Amino acid sequence: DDEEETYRLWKIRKTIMQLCHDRGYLVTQDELDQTLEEFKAQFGDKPSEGRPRRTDLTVLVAHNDDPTDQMFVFFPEEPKVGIKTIKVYCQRMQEENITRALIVVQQGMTPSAKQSLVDMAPKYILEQFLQQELLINITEHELVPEHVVMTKEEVTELLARYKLRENQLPRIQAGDPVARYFGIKRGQVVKIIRPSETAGRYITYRLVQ
Amino acid sequence: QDLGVANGEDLKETLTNCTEPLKAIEQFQTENGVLLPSLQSALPFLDLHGTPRLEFHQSVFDELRDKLLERVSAIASEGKAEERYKKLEDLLEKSFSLVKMPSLQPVVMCVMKHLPKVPEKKLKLVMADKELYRACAVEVKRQIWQDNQALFGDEVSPLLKQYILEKESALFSTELSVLHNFFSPSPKTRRQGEVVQRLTRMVGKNVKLYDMVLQFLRTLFLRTRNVHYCTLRAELLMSLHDLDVGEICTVDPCHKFTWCLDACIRERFVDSKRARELQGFLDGVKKGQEQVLGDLSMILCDPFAINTLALSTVRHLQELVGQETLPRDSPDLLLLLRLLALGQGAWDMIDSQVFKEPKMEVELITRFLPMLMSFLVDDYTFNVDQKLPAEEKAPVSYPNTLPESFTKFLQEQRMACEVGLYYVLHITKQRNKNALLRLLPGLVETFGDLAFGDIFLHLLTGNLALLADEFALEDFCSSLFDGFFLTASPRKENVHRHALRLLIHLHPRVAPSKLEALQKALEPTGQSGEAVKELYSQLGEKLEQLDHRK
Amino acid sequence: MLVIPPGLSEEEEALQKKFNKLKKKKKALLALKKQSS
């Protein structure tokens, strides 16, 4: 199909825009929520060997403050990504001076490339997402409360007020889909605001482990 | 006391005279009152009221006037065109004698507003009266302007001057920001400016007025050499496009080209598909319609179009470096260069009336561009060498020598100068201080002093704000200021203003000795303009505040 | 008609030589990093 492909690409684009905005980046307001027809007009309405193919819509976004760091998003052509395919993206990144980036894989990544992604973590950070992960913004789900990443100063304030250590906070997985959505690293407290039927509002905290 | 009208003049007399004839006065009201028998029986109730008989009649008159205005609008909206226009013409013929009556003037003005063609005698009478002309709606003013080019020019020239002043002031904003610069606003946002909206409202659907505005823009572009007139041409055409004015968009040969270029400007990049669409628009110019090429070059002379095309050219050069390919073998790069050549040669093409595409110099493609690619190549190898393990680190010094041929290309070729200036902006945005210092001496002498233009200097200062920590080094500040800014500031006031803005923004990070030296070197003279003195005073205030923070 | 010259300029040949040297250096460095990874 071709209309299904452009709908899927538009939904992935919308979810990536919302992900960048929730992550704290410069997302243009009309780009943040554009019509499917607007996407088809801007890109070509034929993903099947046509104008809105992959690598055309690699979204480059900067940070809201400190506009240096960017994570210009990647869309591989092939379903199953490999090392010799991600090394081209590594070449494009080392051509630049920016270390973060997101790749949107179609099928599963080869596990050797999964190890390779970790094999450059101190140098430059790479996150990967499957198509099914980006067809729905899970933060819009009613079961998912408001996750907010906390700054280090706020973490110090929290630990000093409650007189507890980072070892004592209830924790959260690094492979958590919400944690992957915000792209938080290990040791980064996330405040969670959720409505409670007994107190109104409850703010919990989840250190990342 | 006009046609069948009793005292306005003898009304002033009636207010001055004051002796006695009561029955004459009463007969005058009876003859010149609301001549309805049904009102004669109702008047004693008003007499039985107590409030003087002026507010009631004024309220009734205002309500009748408003109902008449509503009915004029309804007639203009409903029915067959010929019948409604004939009714409006009859009403105008009956009511035009009261055009100077303030209470009934709105009715006449509305009737004239809804008429497709007002009679020429009434239009001349309105033109002869300044207040009547001012009170007229833009629809009547269009019928006046279409046959009076001088009056339309008098109405339009202040707007054009205001547009130029607004663009220049935007170039000299106090805030230095890479994120919020002259090219930050989207085209749709730019078309919302007061001048563009007012010009679009004045033109409306009148093709003749649009052609007059285009002629004014061409004449001012030739006379003043200001490219923001080209910007205004593009924005006015696209503003008419946003209002679905098909009477103008269908006859303008640049409409589709300007639309595609507007999309490219919005995306800040020209892809292969959009490039091919623009090429198809260019190659579609038929023999005998070559003046359309001059118009298209004027569209391409827009600073936004030039910025988008040059940034796309630099990005394509980087991609060619990545792909191990030569500039001559890339059709998209050649197409971008062709568009840039047309944009740069717009002024010469319009002035000489020779509507032919400028010949792109061979040495540009075959020599200058691959040398820029070699600069990129040196940057990449230096960056890779700096990341090698310490056991393999040879003492690699960054290449600081600028080839003489590169400087000659910047001095003698306009296109090479433009591409090199945008490459300098690109490397400065990447915080590559070594490449910036390598290329800076070649910017002192450039083609037509393009390196000292306000657009380039605005972008350059904005990007230099990203290198704020490097201003603590005396060598970096000496290079930048002494070798580039101070070489031209005594001869160019705009360079002085840009240097003052940069210093005002970055004074907390400049070395104190160099800061004092720059404050002395940038001191305004007796011949300096008011803006330079104001910027210098602001710098002094900031320095005093910084000293107080010790 | 855009007249494209039928030969590389001396500058273009020098830049092709520089680019080939860079390709060789980059390949050597990639081999080095593979040995160090």
The CA distances from residue B431 to B424, B460, B499, in Å, are 11, 12, 19
Q: Are residues A25 and A107 in the same domain?
A: yes
Q: Are residues A2 and A103 in the same domain?
A: yes
| B282: its two tokens | 């260019």
Q: Are residues A130 and A142 in the same domain?
A: no
Residue A141: what residue type? H
Name the DSSP class of A106: S
Q: Are residues A22 and A78 in the same domain?
A: yes
Q: Are residues A144 and A121 in the same domain?
A: no
| Angle in degrees, CA B320, B322, B326, rounded to 5 | 30
**DSSP-assigned letters across all residues of A126-172:** EEEE-TGGGSS-GGGSTTS-EEEEPPHHHHHHHHHHHT--TTTS-EE
Residues in chain B: 550
Say yes or no for a CB contact (<8 Å) between B383 and A94.
Answer: yes
Contact A49, A6 (CB under 8 A): no
Residues in chain A: 209
Q: Are residues A32 and A119 in the same domain?
A: yes
The experimental resolution of this structure, in angstroms, equals: 3.9
Q: Are residues A167 and A125 in the same domain?
A: no
B386 near A CB under 8 A: no
Of B304, B291, B200, B207, the closest CA to residue B262 belongs to B304
d(CA B506, CA B471): 8
**DSSP-assigned letters across all residues of B355-424:** --PPPPPHHIIIIIHHHHHHHHHHHHHHHHHHTS-GGG--------PPPHHHHHHHHH-HHHHHHHHHHH
Residues of A with Cβ-Cβ distance to B380 under 8 angstroms: 95
Q: Are residues A156 and A107 in the same domain?
A: no
| A67: its two tokens | 């506009």
| B141: its two tokens | 């003013």
Q: Tell me the count of B-C CB pairs closer than 8 A.
A: 56
Residues 6+ apart with CB under 8 A from B429: B178, B463, B466
- Number of structural domains (chain A) is 2
Is residue A76 packed enough to be buried (19+ CB in 10 Å), middle (13-18) or exposed (0-12)? buried
| B303: its two tokens | 């600073």
d(CA A154, CA B93): 78
Residues 6+ apart with CB under 8 A from A57: A9, A13, A43, A75
Its domain, for residue A141, covers 137-209
- Domain closes at, from A136, A161, A182: A136
The CA distances from residue B121 to A10, B1, B131, in Å, are 60, 22, 17
**DSSP-assigned letters across all residues of B123-172:** HHHHHH-HHHHHHS-HHHHHHHHTT-HHHHHHHHHHHHHHHHHHHHHHHT
- Domain closes at, from A91, A121, A136: A136
CA distance, residue B426 to nearest chain A CA (Å): 12
d(CA A17, CA B365): 38
Reduce the DSSP state of residue A205 to 3 states and report it.
strand
Minimum CA–CA partner of C24 in chain B: B381
Instruction: Point out the residue among A91, A94, A97 whose CB comes nearest to the CB of B430.
Output: A97
d(CA B546, CA B267): 41
Say yes or no for a CB contact (<8 Å) between B371 and C11.
Answer: yes
B364 near C CB under 8 A: no
Residues of C with Cβ-Cβ distance to B368 under 8 angstroms: 11
Radius of gyration from C-alpha coordinates of chain B: 34
Residue A143: what residue type? L
Residues 6+ apart with CB under 8 A from A24: A63, A64, A149
The CATH code of the domain that includes A157 is 3.90.940.20
The CA distances from residue B189 to B184, B266, B341, B383, B519, in Å, are 10, 11, 28, 39, 38
Other Cβ atoms within 10 Å of A196 Cβ, number: 9
Name the percent of chain C in helix, strand, coil, to the closest 5. Answer: 75, 0, 25
d(CA B217, CA B347): 12
Contact B454, B172 (CB under 8 A): yes
Q: Order the strands of the A190-196 sheet from edge to edge.
A: A146-149, A190-196, A200-208, A171-172
Contact A15, A135 (CB under 8 A): yes
**Experimentally determined by:** cryo-EM
Of B411, B421, B225, B195, the closest CA to residue B306 belongs to B421
B101 near A CB under 8 A: no
d(CA B34, CA B51): 19
Q: Are residues A130 and A141 in the same domain?
A: no
Of B448, B500, B427, the closest CA to residue B227 belongs to B448
Half-sphere exposure of B308 (CA within 13 A, CB side): 26
Q: Are residues A18 and A109 in the same domain?
A: yes
Alpha-carbon torsion (B247, B248, B252, B258), positive or negative = negative
Contact B465, B176 (CB under 8 A): yes
Q: Are residues A178 and A203 in the same domain?
A: yes
Name the percent of chain A in helix, strand, coil, to the closest 5. Answer: 35, 15, 45
The CATH code of the domain that includes A118 is 3.40.1340.10
Of A132, A141, A127, A131, the closest CA to residue A182 belongs to A127
Q: Are residues A202 and A131 in the same domain?
A: no
